[PDB]
Amino acid sequence: WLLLKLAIVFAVLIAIYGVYLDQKIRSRIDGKVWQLPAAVYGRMVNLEPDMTISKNEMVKLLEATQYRQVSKMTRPGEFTVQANSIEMIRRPFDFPDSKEGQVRARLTFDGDHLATIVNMENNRQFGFFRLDPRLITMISSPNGEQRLFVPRSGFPDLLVDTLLATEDRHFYEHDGISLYSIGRAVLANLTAGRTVQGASTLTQQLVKNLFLSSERSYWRKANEAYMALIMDARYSKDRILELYMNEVYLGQSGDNEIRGFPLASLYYFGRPVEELSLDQQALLVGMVKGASIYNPWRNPKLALERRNLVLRLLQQQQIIDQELYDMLSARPLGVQPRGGVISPQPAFMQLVRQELQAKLGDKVKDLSGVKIFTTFDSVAQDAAEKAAVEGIPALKKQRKLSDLETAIVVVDRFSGEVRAMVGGSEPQFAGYNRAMQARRSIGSLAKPATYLTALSQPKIYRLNTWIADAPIALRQPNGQVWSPQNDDRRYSESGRVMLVDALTRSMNVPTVNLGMALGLPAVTETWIKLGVPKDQLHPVPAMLLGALNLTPIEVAQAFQTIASGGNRAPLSALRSVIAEDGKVLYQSFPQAERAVPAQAAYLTLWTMQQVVQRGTGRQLGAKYPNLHLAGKTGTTNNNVDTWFAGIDGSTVTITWVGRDNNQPTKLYGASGAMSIYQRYLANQTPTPLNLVPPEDIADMGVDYDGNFVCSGGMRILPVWTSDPQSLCQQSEM
Amino acid sequence: WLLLKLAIVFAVLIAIYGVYLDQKIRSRIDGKVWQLPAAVYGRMVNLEPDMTISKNEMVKLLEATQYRQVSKMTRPGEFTVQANSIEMIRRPFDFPDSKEGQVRARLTFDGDHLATIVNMENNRQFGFFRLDPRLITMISSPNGEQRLFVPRSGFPDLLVDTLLATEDRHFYEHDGISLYSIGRAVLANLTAGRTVQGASTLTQQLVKNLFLSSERSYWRKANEAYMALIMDARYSKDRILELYMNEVYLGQSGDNEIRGFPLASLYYFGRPVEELSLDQQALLVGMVKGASIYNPWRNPKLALERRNLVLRLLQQQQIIDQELYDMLSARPLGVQPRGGVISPQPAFMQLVRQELQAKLGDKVKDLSGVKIFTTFDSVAQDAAEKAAVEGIPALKKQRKLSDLETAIVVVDRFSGEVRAMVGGSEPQFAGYNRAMQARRSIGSLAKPATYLTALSQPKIYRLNTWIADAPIALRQPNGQVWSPQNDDRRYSESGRVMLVDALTRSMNVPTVNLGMALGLPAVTETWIKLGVPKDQLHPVPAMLLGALNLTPIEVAQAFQTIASGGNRAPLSALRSVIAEDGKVLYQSFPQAERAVPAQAAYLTLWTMQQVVQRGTGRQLGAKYPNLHLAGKTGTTNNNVDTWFAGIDGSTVTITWVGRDNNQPTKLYGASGAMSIYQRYLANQTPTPLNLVPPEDIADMGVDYDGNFVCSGGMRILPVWTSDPQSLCQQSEM
Ligand SMILES: *C(=O)[C@@H](NC(=O)/C(=N\OC(C)(C)C(=O)O)c1csc(N)n1)[C@H](C)NS(=O)(=O)O
Numbered sequence A, B: 001w002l003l004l005k006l007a008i009v010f011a012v013l014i015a016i017y018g019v020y021l022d023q024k025i026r027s028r029i030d031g032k033v034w035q036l037p038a039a040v041y042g043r044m045v046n047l048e049p050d051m052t053i054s055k056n057e058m059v060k061l062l063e064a065t066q067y068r069q070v071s072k073m074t075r076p077g078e079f080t081v082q083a084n085s086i087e088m089i090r091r092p093f094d095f096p097d098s099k100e101g102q103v104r105a106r107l108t109f110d111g112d113h114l115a116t117i118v119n120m121e122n123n124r125q126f127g128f129f130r131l132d133p134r135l136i137t138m139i140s141s142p143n144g145e146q147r148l149f150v151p152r153s154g155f156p157d158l159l160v161d162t163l164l165a166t167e168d169r170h171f172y173e174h175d176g177i178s179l180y181s182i183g184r185a186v187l188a189n190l191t192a193g194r195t196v197q198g199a200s201t202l203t204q205q206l207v208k209n210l211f212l213s214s215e216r217s218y219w220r221k222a223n224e225a226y227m228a229l230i231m232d233a234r235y236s237k238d239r240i241l242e243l244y245m246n247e248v249y250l251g252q253s254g255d256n257e258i259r260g261f262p263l264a265s266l267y268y269f270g271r272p273v274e275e276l277s278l279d280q281q282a283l284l285v286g287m288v289k290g291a292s293i294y295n296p297w298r299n300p301k302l303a304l305e306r307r308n309l310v311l312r313l314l315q316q317q318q319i320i321d322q323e324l325y326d327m328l329s330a331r332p333l334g335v336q337p338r339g340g341v342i343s344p345q346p347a348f349m350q351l352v353r354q355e356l357q358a359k360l361g362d363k364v365k366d367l368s369g370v371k372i373f374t375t376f377d378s379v380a381q382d383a384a385e386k387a388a389v390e391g392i393p394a395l396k397k398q399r400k401l402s403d404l405e406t407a408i409v410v411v412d413r414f415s416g417e418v419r420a421m422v423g424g425s426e427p428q429f430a431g432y433n434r435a436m437q438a439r440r441s442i443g444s445l446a447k448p449a450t451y452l453t454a455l456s457q458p459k460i461y462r463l464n465t466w467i468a469d470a471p472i473a474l475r476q477p478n479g480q481v482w483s484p485q486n487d488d489r490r491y492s493e494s495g496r497v498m499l500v501d502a503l504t505r506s507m508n509v510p511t512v513n514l515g516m517a518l519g520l521p522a523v524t525e526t527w528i529k530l531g532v533p534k535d536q537l538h539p540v541p542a543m544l545l546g547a548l549n550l551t552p553i554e555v556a557q558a559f560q561t562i563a564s565g566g567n568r569a570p571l572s573a574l575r576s577v578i579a580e581d582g583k584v585l586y587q588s589f590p591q592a593e594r595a596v597p598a599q600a601a602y603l604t605l606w607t608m609q610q611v612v613q614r615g616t617g618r619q620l621g622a623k624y625p626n627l628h629l630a631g632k633t634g635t636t637n638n639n640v641d642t643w644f645a646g647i648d649g650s651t652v653t654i655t656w657v658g659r660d661n662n663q664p665t666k667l668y669g670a671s672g673a674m675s676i677y678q679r680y681l682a683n684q685t686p687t688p689l690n691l692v693p694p695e696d697i698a699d700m701g702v703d704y705d706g707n708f709v710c711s712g713g714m715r716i717l718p719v720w721t722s723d724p725q726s727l728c729q730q731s732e733m
């Protein structure tokens, strides 16, 4: 003719263009679809019968782990409260130790301990019950696209319907050949074009997002149609919407694109997609059309009407009715955290990233769908953050200041595992992390090292050992004379104090005489074993009183070493690093090292309970007498810094209060740091400190003179002896 | 399947795209293909037996009309020269009066006249033989494309072959479907592309030039191919190359695109395409590929090799052989005018355009293929141009000057038809046309008006009338006294001069006395009838001597009025304006008006032959005594201007010489203008002036006293009398 000969030649190369398209769609799908960023999780708590935890403590623990209080549990991630129990649906979690599904459980309490954890489905007791970890954040992926991969089955059939009720019928590929005829006929041609009117199948919307550019292609829709004919031909409808539901752009976080319903549900609502309500699903689905302008942060009015349109669109099709309509529209969209949620826990994340580098180097950022399990505690953090946010403006007002900063570090007493980190007064927005970057003179926090060095010598130094408290003059290597004074510029009437009272009252003059008698090399060695940085130790008499500049985290290591009964446990934020296939890339293990004798650490801890009960920290002791806290105070010269090292039955807490410019704070007696700690304790349930005396510890009596007696005596002090017959040697006088 | 269903849908709209293309190709072709600019032609000379023209004059006339001297006439537009004849092939020309073809004719001479014009094909005498006009220029078309439409038959079969030997086989449409397979296979694909290698049929090259843009369309060649399938399907191969041969870009003229072989042949060679030689055809054809870089003006080396490649390409195919090859390559390309040929005859063209406006207004520029027939003379122009180009540097050297300008105007003595116009010393490049724009004091060129006013009164003023030549003092309307002097500051011994000698010697004092006796209103009226602009006449005594500022063209009208025997014929450059269909848009006709009596003009002309023979212009008279030229001289005060008005048997020539800044030229006695005229006469064949005395003219004798005598007398002067018996009335004394 011949429009066929050449018109047939058109058919040939467009079908081979189609086999250039199929051969390239496979390359994407058959393997790496996206670079899935790392998942960062908090601690995984194991509930156990007889555990020292109360009903009120557990509610706060559950709430802190994304659990919602209800009256009728219908969903996973919910809990009810009774007079003596908690009923919960422990959500399914891919636990490293063993994968688990939903568990309907009852936690029966008998104050202040958990008695039983019973499965409500079989009436059987659990030897131990696992709590799922809370997702802290995602480590930013380079191409700026954030996703949390959830398989097809993770998506509830309802959200699947809510989606189809807005964008499909799903009998597709060919993709609505008749839609193109109406879609282009409605507008009555004429160039365009407005409205088209959303002439796109789910398989057309997928190919667009996954494979094609933003716009300028009227050629694209037809090129996308060509791809939406290949995809639904070789991939089942189940895979189409598995890929689709993880790709869809749903929001923004500065320079990071929030995409896919799984990460979106947590981002806007704080729940994994499986736990979403219908009003929540409808909004999320409705956002798809335009994710940026349907922002419940920026313009709720618009989003509050869209969600409501999806509510009204769903009732039009089969599923719902106005009995559940009128109320669903009334329910406010959010359920909105109200925070920008740009960078969660920045201070604690610096430690995580630093530790990730030290343990795996570079060849870890190469991998996809990585799972990072941290030591992070949600309860301890919230309490520390609150103490900072509330305590700082309170102190600024009382003392009257224009600026004031803080730093809190909470570590496991025994394991060294970091539970909480506060880098400033505004922890929600941080760039300077004072917990790891603020190097400061520790002041009187340097005192226990000297007493721990002395008490490590049980045949020479004991708690009843008399120390001179009289004027000092120390000739130094310039000729200048060092004359240290006690905070009050006074000396003891008798010219002497006992070791026990010298540390209880943080006495300067008796600490120098003790330190100088032991010698600086000896005290310098204790500091090394406690775990402080080697390059910060300058062995001059001044260091016995605080001429030692450390960060709160470095201080936390030193006090952990002593709080654990003499075992130095290197501080850490990493519990494990797991690949998507389940390969254990990194696994932490106990590496605690015996630093100082058990008995020497016990006598220091016992004396530290005395500072809190009757000495420098007595104001705290009187507020919480039943906790028997072991602590130590710090106030540097010219009120530059206030410090507090507090030990409960479970944690070591280092609180620092000072100004970024190193200026006076008008606060003394560790008043700043001690009242921030006071709030931290008031904001949660601290563990009472019950000291287990190690072997060779004997409570001995002394007379007013400080000499051991057989029976009686006016004062009882613990002593490191296998044979308390030091009494006889003393009594024989 | 279904790549056919939709692959068949592709066939449908591309064929209807083809019926959108056919419906739009017709719109262009079926009527106005281009806006064909106006054709401007010189005079059409009619050769006639007994005509006062010599063999040498005719050779120069033929050469000036694009005729070539040869030894063996083989082509139209050629001529041979014998001892007593000229043999020529008068080219075919579309004459307004009657269309004509080639005529092989012999012009037999019998010095100084043409005796016979015989047709060499039938041995028959012509009553009159038409000479074809020379193309001066083309009036610029707005879209900047210049073309001269020649039909299919106007193109010789050889140039047609020379073209096919370079760009075709011509069995086309489909257009070399196999060329696309080789053209794209030779380069071995890979994007491009170099060389393609000229994969284009003549029908593809046409559609490209006529319908499509410059580049960026790999889509264009296929779109052009689609058009090259439609054109050769509905238009015969004869029409294809009729359109093609008028479209092809062949050269540039500043901002005007020279396109099509007809206008190109004249542009580079100076001959209509039918008259081209094979080396000429080959070059022109070869230029097509690239017309700009194959420029015989800019880079001959390149063009001298291309033409030679076309010579070598033609021998490869059938037609030629090296016997006519080696020589054809040796022949230098041009045959090149060597002029930029931007704007031919700019000075004379201003008059044409001015006259075109006055006669047809605006609704003439709307029309296409217009033919303008002018009064322009090639022989007179070349002679005038040469006199200017040679005379001016000659005068600059002799007198020693840094600047000097000129202006020459040549008009038909009887009809007023403008034959030549020079606007400056450099006529080849002009923007200021001094012939129509230089308003100057005419000086002594104002003298004949007064004598013509006096001689118009035959009973009062005659040639023998005595005029006083004595000191003058004229009281004027400020109180100041006008005392004019003769050029030499002397007066006649007798205190008197005769009318005849007063004008012969351009005497100032006797011209004032005569003018004042006639009165200024009378002399002012002669000036009106002569045809000078009414607003330039300021009736004060000073105007009798040259206080009258005119342009050389205005001066040409005044002297034409007197040279024609008293008939004012309004000056013109337009003979006719004809449409392409042959519609006479404008036709000029004789409109001569009786201004002054025949006898008064005769006596002024006779006296003007005396100035040339024995008076002010005697230097010219002695060089050409047999021409009996009637003339008048002019030198303004402070040698600002030199003028000369010269009359031969056929023309009035106004020559002006002066400086643009109105400064001294050191030239007197009309030396500048008179020697430019001298050269103009030496550069051609002037017509001897033979005055036919009108009715009532009688040659009468006068004695030394200036009184009419019966017989004898020492001086014979023509007199306006029906009865020479004024002699008796005089003799009776
Ligand atoms: C302990 O922190 C202790 N303070 C000091 O030893 C320091 N300064 O205190 C003096 C008396 C110099 C003061 O001017 O207030 C000190 C050591 S290092 C450094 N930069 N300053 C206090 C008194 N004990 S506490 O219990 O009050 O905190």
Ligand SMILES: *C(=O)[C@@H](NC(=O)/C(=N\OC(C)(C)C(=O)O)c1csc(N)n1)[C@H](C)NS(=O)(=O)O
Pocket (backbone or CB within 6 Å): B441, B442, B443, B444, B445, B485, B486, B487, B505, B506, B508, B545, B546, B547, B616, B633, B634, B635, B636, B637, B638, B639, B668, B669, B670
């Ligand atoms: C004629 O052209 C005539 N010249 C004059 O009349 C003029 N000037 O001549 C004088 C004597 C003033 C001079 O200084 O040279 C004249 C008239 S109008 C004007 N601007 N100047 C001459 C002398 N006759 S001719 O035959 O030589 O040309």
